[PDB]
Amino acid sequence: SFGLCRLRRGFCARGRCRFPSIPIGRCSRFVQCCRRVW
């Protein structure tokens, strides 16, 4: 967890990703590695 992501700019988000954020991967099990999509 965490290490498998945050490569470019993936931020860990609790549960579901925020509106302006896409779930490119998972930071953990529930925590997603939401990537900005601005």
From Swiss-Prot:
Keywords: Antibiotic, Antimicrobial, Defensin, Disulfide bond, Fungicide, Secreted
GO cellular component: extracellular region
GO biological process: defense response to bacterium; defense response to fungus; killing of cells of another organism
InterPro entries in the cross-refs: Defensin_beta-like
Pfam name, any one: Defensin_beta
Cysteines engaged in disulfide bonds, as pairs: C5-C33, C12-C27, C17-C34
Tissue: Secreted into the stomach cavity.
Major localisation: secreted
Subcellular location: Secreted
Signal sequence, start to end: none
Keyword Metal-binding: no
Record text on subunit structure and interactions: Monomer.
Function: Has antifungal activity and antibacterial activity against Gram-positive and Gram-negative bacteria. Involved in the process of food preservation in the stomach during the incubation fast. May also be present during infection.
Family (UniProt): Belongs to the beta-defensin family.
Protein name in UniProt: Spheniscin-2
